[PDB]
């Protein structure tokens, strides 16, 4: 048990003990990047490997070589927070040692001079936070793990759809990590074909010739030998007795003076056995049987030196005679069978256009680069460079592994390039598949599916950078003078830096972390994608790959995937899942040895798991843990059934391991249909944090893990006592056993305060601990947004009643009491970042000055002298945050305006008002302001006020650091001096600064005093340098874009509570949009007179089958019951005994549950606090499939004083009369998603317009109008409304004349239209006429 658990304990139903507890949920993200940037003294993946690949770069024969020595990553320029404020990227400089050697010309190899250029800088590579996030521009970002076809070889079918003759087809595909694809495929004529990439089809054998195999060796490779002897005269044959299987006698089969088979009798196992036991090696055959036989090798006349027959040719009765008289004793033929061993390769040769290696290479080179004249060196170079070059081709480790394994080889590791043996063996396996032995794999199987992560992808993009730098290095080493240039002048920065910057900045897999929510973060960071580079597209791959595979078990969550255009192309990572050593997916299991279930954990990959019979997470074992029944539900290969008692090899670790963290947070999930569960876990991530993090009343027991693992909270590094608790920071005094000897210590935690999240919500940490409190190591020191006391609260639980209320709940609609909007619980704090840009126009520079043409004193009031709004001033729509004015001279007015000016004597300014003002309708308070200035431009008044302020605050903070730290150290010196020379009152008298002189008796304690001395001084100077650095960082001008002189960013905090039109939802996939906000007066209430917060619609429950939301209600009610009781017993102030008794009773609850409990806990001070927290309601945990049962819920309702039905009497708050029938009332945990209506709402009358084609377009974030499409037009066409349509597509939109001539009539009170011609068609006319086409408008 822990210390914050003594504060609050969640009551846990469920039986199954957890043999393994949930690991770090962020494991994948951090591990990957941990592998990428790291020093590995070998070829294992990392910057080292990608370096060793392309390097060393040598010139072309010129013997000028550039070799790579070692690299390093410099300390980050700005740390995370600073990088977030300013908007730069959090990255490290990459400094790599390059050694330039020049070989003496006409060597034995030795170097004239080798200049070692010390660490030339190439690029700045981004860094991953402790939370697995990257900051690109002032913004946290996540790189999604990728799921693709693993490198290796693969065998597929494509039966059915091709050709509609059936017969299937069989294909092999060699997919390397890098390099061209190698494809083999059959056809309806059983001719084997090969194609490189997706390119032109070539007869298979044509590649073999390029490996230097004559026809004879191809035949010798793919077929066996049928021996023919002419001995004495007329035709014997060698007979392997198995050859006659699946065939019928063509003649009398007889040898050894005994006739085994007669013509017309199919040769069966009997005949074959007779031949085998009588051992017939040689039989006599007719000269006519070789009429169809295919000769193996070449045959020439020994005398005339002429070719009798070429290899692979069909013999004839005459050809036999022609080669027999030449003195040929033996003839080798192919062993061919249309059932067992197929004659494919032979016909493949029959379609082969080539003869010799060079010819094949010609056809290949003319295939890959067609139309241009082929050359010998060209064909050779290309073909050798395709699959055989260390440069252009790699399957790497996973590739070679899966390759060799799928080829049934021994070696698990080998070369990254193909060999003749490789290609040949692949062809062999394909031919074997067509022959009937062996099966085709499937793409969806997770054994053929591989997971990449941030590290690998970043490695690849950096690899591209390194190759594009390689070309440059070789390009320069060409003409180079000797000792002048060094490994700087060649190697650039921008190519590499942009190679990585392009990746992290914009990529389909790199995105802005979804942080509105601790669940959203952690569920984004565990994610898979089959999209992007190396993957498929939504438009390409169909249902199969998307569909849930049996191999998804324990690895990919079945129920959490997006609902949109890409379904199952994302999924999510399962709870207990892990990335395999080779990069596959493996899931925890429990080993069953003999008849016992062992608690030893075992990790099995998708293929590892295949043959084993695995037991169930939910099964009954007891005592020694032997299976209670004689047969139990299990799953062995791809399916599930009842399995014998001792058969099963393994068992599921937990009940949750099938799902993900999102699904594992849904209570009573087993009772919900999969569609609504999907929708539920999909929406649970959209929950905006509330103002008061509440807690789920109805839980799971995962929420704690999500809260802690996600970095939103603040977790103790080391256990100790709290010295100080501020809303700003938290200072903990470390225990000695956990404490390092030197630098004494205290752990100081600087809490994140109100700041802008990625979703424009607020992220703010609050302290959960008090002054002088015991804290265990690994305990929550502070709550993040939407986290309560170390658990995950994504929303708030409330009293809910299921019953139709005056149709205000009509579809999914939600009817909420005024009690809720008053309590401000569902209220949310949004943090927006607004910016003002001072640019340079040819008319002049723009001023941030507070002097603005045409504004009242009320407008210039909220701004200081410099033109920026004061921190803390509450603003609304139209208020000026930053005064900005840009020059535009000579307005060039008109006559009447000139008259007006003549009468009113006003000087029309040469300056225009560009000032940044709060967007219309939004309102809030200003929590911060930043000013970025071009380095060298004079900082205005405001920016200087701010700079001085920040300097002072910096000095104050650093000084605080050094002070608490120093006191912390001297407090330890005081304690060590007291051993061996203790003087109590004597020591604390003299000045503390003079303490270091005092020594001790001979012992190690003197050396400890030494340690504290050293570290003390270290801290003392480190303070100095830190203050210096901070000051310089504050004062330095931030680098800005072209033309921008300065930038002012204002940070607003808006508070929006709740209003009709907002979206709210439970965890069960039940949506709703709040309809009306109803007075507490009109609210349904019970006999006790307590109104219900929310009134739902029962009709929503039966159709969409989610019954969990009802269970969740019931138990929820019961939970609150346990609270209310306690809430009375505390308000009764009974005593420790009564409370303790009742709480214990609650935590026990009938029989058979795994929770355990108290009175190991302090009877007074600890218990009363527990009850104190419980009084809101009693938090309950419902494990995913292990969850609570009806009887348990009713039993807990009995303890609650509340009915079993879960329904009570309710009265209409209006008439006061009772509602007929009982209605269900309970507590349902509810989330406010951020769809909030003051975001969604838009309206436009006359806005800006697009330049290219004149059409309505928002330029101000004053929205463009709605898009009227084809279907809407049709809908207008069905109705007889012509004028509505015409005005829709002419005057209201596209007509440049029509819109204004309209507006004037609209204000004049005349409703008409003088339409003219739409500008789209007008432009199209020109576009058509811009060609050789004349398009005219006729007649009149």
């Amino acid at each position: 048990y822990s210390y914050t658990e003594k504060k609050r304990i969640r009551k846990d139903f469920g039986k199954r003990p957890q043999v393994l507890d949930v690991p770090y949920l962020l494991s994948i993200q951090l591990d990957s990047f941990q592998k990428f940037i790291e020093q590995d003294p070998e070829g294992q993946y990392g910057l080292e490997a990608a370096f060793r690949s392309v390097f060393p770069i040598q010139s072309y024969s010129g013997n000028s070589e550039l070799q790579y020595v070692s690299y390093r990553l410099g300390e980050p320029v700005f740390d995370v927070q600073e990088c977030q404020i300013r908007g730069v990227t959090y990255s490290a400089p990459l400094r790599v040692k390059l050694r330039l050697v020049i070989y003496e010309r006409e060597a034995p190899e030795g170097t004239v001079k080798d200049i070692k250029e010390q660490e030339v800088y190439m690029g700045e590579i981004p860094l991953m936070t402790d939370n697995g996030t990257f900051v690109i521009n002032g913004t946290e970002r996540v790189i999604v793990s990728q799921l693709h076809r693993s490198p290796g070889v693969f065998f597929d079918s494509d039966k059915g759809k091709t050709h509609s003759s059936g017969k299937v087809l069989y294909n092999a595909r060699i997919i390397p990590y890098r390099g061209s694809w190698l494809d083999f495929e059959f056809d309806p004529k059983d001719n084997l074909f090969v194609r490189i990439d997706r390119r032109r089809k070539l007869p298979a054998t044509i590649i073999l010739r390029a490996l230097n195999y004559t026809t004879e060796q191809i035949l010798d490779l793919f077929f066996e030998k049928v021996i023919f002897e002419i001995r004495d005269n007329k035709l014997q044959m060698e007979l392997v007795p198995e050859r006659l299987r699946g065939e019928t006698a063509s003649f009398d089969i007889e040898a050894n003076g005994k006739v085994y088979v007669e013509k017309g009798r199919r040769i069966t196992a009997r005949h074959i056995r007779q031949l085998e036991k009588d051992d017939v090696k040689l039989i006599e055959v007719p000269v006519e049987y070789i009429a169809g036989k295919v000769v193996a090798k070449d045959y020439i006349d020994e005398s005339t030196g002429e070719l009798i027959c070429a290899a692979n040719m069909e013999l004839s009765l005459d050809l036999l005679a022609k080669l027999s008289q030449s003195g040929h004793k033996r003839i080798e033929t192919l062993f061919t069978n249309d059932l067992d061993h197929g004659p494919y390769i032979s016909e493949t040769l029959r379609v082969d256009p080539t003869n010799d290696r060079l010819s094949a290479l010609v056809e290949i080179y003319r295939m890959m680069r067609p139309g241009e004249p082929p050359t010998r060196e060209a064909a050779e170079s290309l073909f050798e460079n395709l699959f055989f070059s260390e440069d252009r081709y790699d399957l790497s480790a996973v590739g070679r592994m899966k390759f060799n394994r799928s080829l049934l080889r021994e070696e698990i590791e080998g070369s990254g390039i193909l060999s003749k043996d490789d290609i040949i063996d692949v062809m062999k396996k394909l031919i074997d598949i067509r022959n009937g032995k062996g099966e085709v794999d499937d793409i969806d199987h997770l054994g053929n599916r591989r997971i990449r992560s941030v590290g690998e992808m970043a490695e690849n993009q950096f690899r591209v950078g390194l190759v594009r730098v390689e070309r440059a290095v070789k390009e320069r080493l060409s003409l180079g003078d000797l000792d002048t240039l060094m490994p700087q002048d060649m190697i650039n920065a921008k190519p590499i830096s942009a190679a990585v910057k392009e990746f992290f900045g914009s990529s389909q897999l790199s995105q802005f972390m979804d942080q509105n929510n601790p669940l959203s973060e952690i569920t984004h960071k565990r994610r898979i994608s089959a999209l992007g580079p190396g993957g498929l597209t939504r438009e390409r791959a169909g249902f199969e790959v998307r569909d849930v595979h049996p191999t998804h078990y324990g690895r990919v969550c079945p129920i959490e995937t997006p609902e949109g255009p890409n379904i199952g192309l994302i999924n999510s990572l399962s709870v207990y899942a892990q990335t395999n050593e080779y990069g596959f997916l493996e899931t925890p299991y429990r080993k069953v040895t003999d008849g016992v279930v062992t608690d030893e954990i075992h990790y099995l990959s998708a293929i590892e798991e295949g043959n084993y019979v695995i037991a169930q997470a939910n099964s009954n074992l007891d005592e020694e843990g032997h299976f209670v029944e004689d047969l139990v539900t299990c799953r062995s290969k791809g399916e599930s059934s009842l399995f014998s008692r001792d058969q099963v090899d393994y068992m599921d670790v937990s009940t949750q391991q099938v799902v993900s963290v999102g699904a594992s947070l849904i209570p009573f999930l087993e009772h919900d249909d999969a569609n609504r569960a999907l929708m539920g876990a999909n929406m649970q991530r959209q929950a905006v944090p509330t103002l008061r993090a509440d807690k789920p009343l109805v839980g799971t027991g995962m929420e704690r893990a999500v809260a802690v693992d996600s970095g939103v909270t603040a977790v103790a590094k080391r256990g100790g006592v709290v010295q100080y608790v501020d809303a700003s920071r938290i200072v903990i005094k470390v225990n000695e056993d956990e404490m390092y000897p030197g630098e004494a210590g205290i752990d100081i935690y600087n809490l994140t305060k109100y700041t802008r999240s990625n979703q424009n919500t607020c992220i703010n940490q609050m302290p959960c601990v008090s002054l002088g409190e015991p804290v265990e190591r690994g305990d929550v020191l502070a709550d993040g947004p939407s986290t309560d006391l170390g658990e995950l609260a994504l929303g708030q639980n409330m009293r809910v009643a299921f019953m139709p209320w005056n149709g205000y709940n009509f579809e999914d609609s939600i009817l909420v009491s005024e009690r809720v909007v008053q309590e401000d619980r569902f209220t949310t704090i949004h943090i927006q970042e607004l910016a003002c840009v001072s640019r340079d126009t040819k008319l002049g520079p723009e001023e941030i000055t507070a002097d603005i043409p045409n504004v009242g004193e009320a407008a210039l009031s909220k701004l200081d002298e410099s033109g920026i709004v004061y921190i803390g001033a509450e603003v609304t729509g139209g208020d000026i945050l930053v005064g900005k004015v840009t020059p535009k001279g000579e307005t060039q007015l008109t006559p009447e305006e000139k008259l007006l000016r003549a009468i009113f004597g006003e000087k029309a300014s040469d300056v225009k008002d560009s000032s940044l003002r709060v967007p219309n309708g939004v309102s809030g308070t200003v929590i911060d302001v930043q000013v970025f200035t071009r380095d060298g431009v004079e900082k205005d008044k405001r920016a200087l006020e701010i700079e001085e302020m920040q300097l002072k605050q910096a000095k104050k903070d650093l000084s605080e650091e050094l002070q608490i730290l120093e006191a912390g150290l001297f407090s330890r010196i005081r304690a060590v001096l007291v051993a061996g020379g203790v003087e109590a009152e004597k020591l604390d008298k003299l000045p503390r600064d003079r303490w270091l002189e005092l020594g001790l008796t001979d012992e190690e304690k003197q050396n400890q005093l030494e340690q504290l001395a050293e570290q003390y001084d270290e801290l003392k100077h480190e303070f100095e340098k830190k203050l210096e650095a901070k000051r310089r960082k504050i004062t330095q001008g931030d680098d800005l874009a072209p033309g921008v002189l300065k930038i002012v960013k204002v940070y607003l905090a808006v508070k929006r509570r709740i209003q009709p039109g907002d979206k709210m939802a439970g965890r069960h996939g039940n949506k709703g949009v709040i309809s009306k906000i109803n007075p507490i007066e009109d609210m349904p209430y019970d006999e006790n007179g307590t109104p219900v917060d929310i009134v739902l619609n029962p009709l929503g429950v039966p159709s969409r089958m989610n019954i969990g939301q009802i269970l969740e209600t019931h138990l929820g009610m019961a939970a609150k019951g346990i609270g209310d009781k306690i809430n009375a017993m505390l308000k009764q102030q009974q005593e420790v005994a009564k409370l303790r008794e009742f709480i214990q009773r609650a935590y026990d609850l009938g029989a058979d549950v795994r929770q355990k409990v108290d009175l190991s806990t302090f009877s007074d001070e600890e218990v009363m606090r527990l009850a104190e927290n419980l009084r809101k309601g009693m938090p309950i945990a419902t494990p995913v499939f292990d969850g609570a049962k009806e009887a348990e819920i009713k039993e807990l309702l009995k303890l609650g004083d509340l009915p079993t039905s879960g329904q009570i009497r309710l009265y209409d708050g209006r008439t006061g009369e009772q509602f007929e029938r009982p209605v269900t009332v309970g507590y349902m945990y509810m989330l406010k998603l951020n769809h909030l209506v003051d975001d969604k709402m838009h309206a436009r009358s006359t806005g800006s317009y697009s330049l290219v084609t004149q059409q309505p377009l928002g330029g101000k974030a004053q929205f463009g109008g709605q898009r009227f499409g084809e279907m809407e037009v049709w809908a207008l066409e069905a109705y007889g409304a012509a004028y509505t349509l015409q005005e829709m597509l002419t005057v209201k939109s596209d007509d440049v004349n029509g819109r204004t001539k309209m507006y004037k009539n609209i204000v004049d009170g005349n409703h008409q239209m003088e339409p003219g011609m739409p500008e789209s068609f007008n432009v199209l006319l020109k576009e058509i006429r811009s060609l050789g086409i004349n398009i005219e408008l006729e007649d009149e």
Binding site: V77, V120, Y121, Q488, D489, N492, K494, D1039, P1042
Partner: protein, 52 residues
């Protein structure tokens, strides 16, 4: 040609200065009034395809 020289200076001073030279750095390295960098540095840029 001016733009090209401006590129050369960048290439040398980039790893030499450890990050990149300040916008005014190559300015003194170049013979002319040296604020011109910005001006030049602007006009050098090719217009982005409107179809991007």
């Amino acid at each position: 040609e001016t733009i090209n020289k401006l590129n050369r200076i960048s290439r040398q001073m980039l790893q030499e200065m450890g990050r990149e030279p300040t916008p005014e750095e190559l300015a003194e390295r170049m013979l002319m009034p040296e604020d011109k960098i910005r001006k030049v540095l602007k006009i050098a840029k090719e217009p982005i395809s409107m179809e991007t």
